[PDB]
Design a binder for this molecule. Structure first.
Ligand SMILES: *[C@@H]1O[C@H](CO)[C@@H](O)[C@H](O)[C@H]1NC(C)=O
Ligand SMILES: *[C@@H]1O[C@H](CO)[C@@H](O)[C@H](O)[C@H]1NC(C)=O
Ligand SMILES: *[C@@H]1O[C@H](CO)[C@@H](O)[C@H](O)[C@H]1NC(C)=O
Ligand SMILES: *[C@@H]1O[C@H](CO)[C@@H](O)[C@H](O)[C@H]1NC(C)=O
Ligand SMILES: *[C@@H]1O[C@H](CO)[C@@H](O)[C@H](O)[C@H]1NC(C)=O
Ligand SMILES: *[C@@H]1O[C@H](CO)[C@@H](O)[C@H](O)[C@H]1NC(C)=O
Ligand SMILES: *[C@@H]1O[C@H](CO)[C@@H](O)[C@H](O)[C@H]1NC(C)=O
Ligand SMILES: *[C@@H]1O[C@H](CO)[C@@H](O)[C@H](O)[C@H]1NC(C)=O
Ligand SMILES: *[C@@H]1O[C@H](CO)[C@@H](O)[C@H](O)[C@H]1NC(C)=O
Ligand SMILES: *[C@@H]1O[C@H](CO)[C@@H](O)[C@H](O)[C@H]1NC(C)=O
Ligand SMILES: *[C@@H]1O[C@H](CO)[C@@H](O)[C@H](O)[C@H]1NC(C)=O
Lengths: 338, 225, 200
């Protein structure tokens, strides 16, 4: 065995049905390969290897794939960009993401870190060799991470550096909490339901760990300070509808109120294109009950700078870089060539 | 690669102002932008940063509510807003691109903020407007270790005042300082003459101050005691 | 939040060192010339980007980082500053000596009779005839430092290529007649002079 870190074009694999109209299947039948039946892992005994989740090329290829899945699937009636405007036909689609696996070609292999407190950047004691990652759902969402993998043992805090306030911090939860979003049978308005008891228990635990990493300082949360609608609220796609939820009450400092927390959301039809660019118009929503249950597995936060001369650290929710989503799922993988 | 900032602006107490930074030569949408402030005589202060991709921001507690940063990605332009202008806010404001932070591929590999590309700065001057001609006062000479005497020109607006000595015939060792803008939004300036001590009681010195904005001409003789 | 010395000077062909004291955190350096926009020189204590001269170098030793400039040229005349994230130093004027150093005359003028007849008290301190053009002006009431009411002007070239500066301390007569002593303290290339004045 002789290897070195390398960057290569991976290929995706999935268990898409070839006879499906749901668009993640349509896209994976042509873009990916069938997933391997009986797959092999081999533990590399007494091997220690340094991973680094914040510099990892898998994350970038997975972004390009997801970008290109959305551009093929989402059908906005109008697209308006730098002077342009294209009107098209915009039927509604069957939307629900499916697990994707990422796989090395010949001559390369994917190292996977099995050390279960692994924050994402250190050296790793219990390394494995695999041909594919596990099944990652390409769900895009801001503020909260949905339908992801859980932390194995203790809640984990990831960041390229906590002392640099310009770097996103990613909290990976112990134990998931359901978020139930529903537009029922004026018609843009919906809401999400969260069990306040479970959630606050978890949020208390998340502050105790943030306290660990900030020299037992006083931790408080605050609404996002600025930016576009997609980052200042928990945004996401359910069944092709673009939901935007005010999550202010999710971070209620006062009570670290324990019935059900209900967040006000709206289904929007004008959305910014997350290919930077411009905006896209979508058709008004379905009739009947649009309903999505999702595990909350992670949160993306930003620490407020200044405040060295103080006794408190303040955090605000916010995504914006969809790539950190991917990082929260690929932090244990690294591609090498033999 | 370059940042082109907007020209200098003048405002009164209260009010708001907006100053822009126009990127060119590079992909504005990657890379974070910080703003920075320098008051006259002080060092730079950090005002916050703004990720032009999603518009996310981060301001130190002393400036949240007083500063806001925004952008327009279609023209690749950053914007800084200073609300509730006080005389403290008179300063030089700088926008800068940090190649170490941002979305997309070309982060530069520096753990510190890589404050790479700087604009030239925009001057925000807070002058409580109105007018007000100045009052002129003698800096009288008193206590080899020769003589210096002069003129204090206090509380006027706007610039400028002209100062001269003996209606322009004295030019030897005279030096009129720049005006300084005080807490009151009014300017003040001083002018001096080094003279040989053997000339007090025999050579005579007059301040000639002229402020045309308010029709004011004063002649103030400086006597020692 | 990072100290830094206010001025530093040396002559062509020599070398100088700017320091800032205050962090153990990665520090980078910038050089702002007159008329131009700042440019990065050193990052992360001692690294150089491509396109920066080998005369610039960086070093750190327990809570103080240093920028060192070898083989000084007069194009290096400028302002130099450091940061460790949002922790910034006050900046240092670097002068490449183009003429012999000259200490300042300072004279401190008390409130004129005529301004006190108008209920105002302006102390004015005029510093003149110095090179390099960088000084510190500190007001003292009796023995104590003064923070409020101080407006100082930046050194501007005199009529003979030396520098002058002016400083003003604005008081009401109450606070004026409440100290018995007031002084202007001017520091220049190490040496301080203090002129004192009294309600008399
Ligand atoms: C190494 O990783 C495997 C994953 O299959 C895990 O089951 C095992 O407990 C790990 N070993 C140690 C010592 O943690
Ligand atoms: C992650 O762990 C490594 C050691 O394994 C440590 O050097 C690094 O500071 C840690 N980072 C965070 C964000 O905890
Ligand atoms: C939600 O969380 C439960 C753990 O209680 C897990 O078994 C289930 O797979 C999760 N659903 C997802 C990830 O869609
Ligand atoms: C959650 O993590 C905390 C500390 O991070 C720990 O005390 C607790 O046992 C964990 N809970 C679960 C369900 O693993
Ligand atoms: C989600 O909410 C709907 C309507 O409020 C409810 O009927 C449904 O049972 C909920 N689902 C879960 C898993 O709680
Ligand atoms: C919320 O979770 C708690 C567990 O802490 C449990 O009683 C139940 O699942 C929920 N309670 C209510 C009142 O909804
Ligand atoms: C934890 O931090 C607080 C500071 O907010 C301090 O007052 C308290 O004593 C600390 N607790 C312990 C057990 O040290
Ligand atoms: C969410 O609601 C709270 C209080 O009503 C506050 O954070 C903010 O006004 C709302 N956020 C929006 C409208 O984006
Ligand atoms: C926090 O919880 C309780 C609600 O029962 C109350 O103190 C307050 O209204 C809440 N804060 C919010 C909703 O921002
Ligand atoms: C999360 O998984 C559930 C279960 O399949 C699905 O119904 C829901 O749409 C998913 N949420 C998102 C945002 O993809
Ligand atoms: C930021 O984190 C790195 C670890 O990757 C550490 O070396 C560095 O000291 C931290 N920041 C500063 C300013 O030192």
């Amino acid at each position: 065995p002789v290897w070195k870190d390398a960057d290569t074009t991976l290929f995706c694999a999935s268990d898409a049905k070839a006879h499906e109209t749901e668009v993640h299947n349509v896209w994976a039948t042509h873009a990916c390969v069938p997933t391997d039946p009986n797959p092999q892992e081999i533990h590399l005994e007494n091997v220690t290897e340094n991973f680094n989740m914040w510099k990892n090329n898998m994350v970038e290829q997975m972004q390009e794939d997801v970008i290109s899945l959305w551009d093929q699937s989402l059908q906005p009636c109008v697209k308006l960009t730098g002077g342009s405007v294209i009107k098209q036909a915009c039927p509604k689609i069957s939307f629900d993401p499916i697990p994707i696996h990422y796989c090395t070609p010949a001559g390369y292999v994917i190292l996977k870190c099995n050390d279960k407190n692994f924050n994402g950047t250190g050296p790793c004691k219990n390394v494995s060799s695999v041909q594919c990652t596990h099944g990652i759902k390409p769900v895009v969402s801001t503020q909260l991470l949905l339908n992801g993998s859980l932390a194995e043992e203790e809640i984990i805090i990831r960041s390229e550096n906590l002392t640099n306030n310009a770097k996103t911090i990613i909290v990976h939860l112990n134990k998931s909490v359901e978020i139930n979003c529903t537009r029922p049978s004026d018609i843009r308005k919906a809401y999400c339901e969260i069990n306040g008891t479970k959630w606050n228990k978890v949020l208390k635990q998340v502050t105790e760990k943030l306290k660990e990493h900030f020299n037992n300082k006083t931790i408080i949360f605050q609404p996002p300070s600025g930016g576009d609608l997609e980052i200042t609220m928990h945004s996401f796609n359910c069944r092709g509808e673009f939901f935007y939820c005010n999550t202010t009450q999710l971070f209620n400092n006062t009570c670290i109120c324990n019935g059900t927390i209900t967040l006000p959301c709206k289904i929007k039809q004008i959305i910014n294109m997350w290919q930077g660019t411009g905006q896209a118009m979508y058709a008004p929503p379905i009739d009947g009950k649009i309903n999505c249950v999702s595990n909350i597995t992670g949160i993306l936060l930003t620490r407020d700078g200044g405040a060295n001369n103080t006794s408190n650290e303040t955090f605000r929710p916010g995504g914006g870089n969809i790539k950190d989503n991917w990082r929260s799922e690929l932090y244990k993988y690294k591609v090498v060539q033999i | 690669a370059g940042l082109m900032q907007s020209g200098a602006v003048m405002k009164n107490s209260g009010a708001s102002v907006r100053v822009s930074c126009q990127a060119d030569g590079y992909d504005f949408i990657d890379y974070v932008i910080h703003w920075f402030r320098q008051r006259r005589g002080e060092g730079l202060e950090w005002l916050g940063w703004m990720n032009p991709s999603g518009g996310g921001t981060n301001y130190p507690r002393p400036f949240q509510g007083k500063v806001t940063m925004t952008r327009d990605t279609s023209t690749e332009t950053a914007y800084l807003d200073v609300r509730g202008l006080t005389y403290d806010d008179t300063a030089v404001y700088y926008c800068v691109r940090d190649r170490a932070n941002g979305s997309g591929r070309r982060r530069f590999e520096s753990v510190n903020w890589f404050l790479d590309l700087w604009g030239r700065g925009t001057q925000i001057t807070v002058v409580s407007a109105s007018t007000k001609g100045p009052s002129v006062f003698p800096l009288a000479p008193s206590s080899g270790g020769t003589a210096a005497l002069g003129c204090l020109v206090k509380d006027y607006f706007p610039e400028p005042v002209t100062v001269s000595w003996n209606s322009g015939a004295l030019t030897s060792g005279v030096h009129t300082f720049p005006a300084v803008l005080q807490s009151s939004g009014l300017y003040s300036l001083s002018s001096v003459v080094t003279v040989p001590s053997s000339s007090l009681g025999t050579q005579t010195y007059i301040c000639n101050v002229n402020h045309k904005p308010s029709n004011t001409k004063v002649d103030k003789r400086v006597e020692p005691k | 939040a990072l100290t830094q010395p206010r001025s530093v000077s040396a002559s062509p062909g020599q070398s100088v060192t700017i320091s800032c004291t205050g962090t153990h955190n990665y520090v980078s350096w910038c050089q702002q010339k007159p008329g131009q926009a700042p440019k990065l020189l050193i990052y992360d204590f001692n690294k150089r980007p491509s396109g920066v001269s080998d005369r610039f170098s960086g070093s750190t030793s327990g809570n103080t980082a240093s920028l060192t400039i070898s083989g000084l040229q007069a194009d290096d005349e400028g302002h130099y500053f450091c940061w460790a994230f949002e922790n910034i130093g006050g900046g240092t004027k670097l002068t490449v000596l183009g003429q012999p150093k000259a200490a300042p005359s300072v004279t401190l003028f008390p409130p004129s009779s005529e301004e006190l007849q108008a209920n105002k008290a302006t102390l004015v301190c005029l510093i003149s005839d110095f090179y390099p053009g960088a000084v510190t002006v500190a007001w003292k009431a009796d023995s104590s430092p003064v923070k409020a009411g101080v407006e100082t002007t930046t050194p501007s070239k005199q009529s003979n290529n030396k520098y002058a500066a002016s400083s003003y301390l604005s008081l009401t007569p109450e606070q004026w007649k409440s100290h018995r002593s007031y002084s202007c303290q001017v520091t220049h290339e190490g040496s301080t002079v203090e002129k004192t004045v009294a309600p008399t």
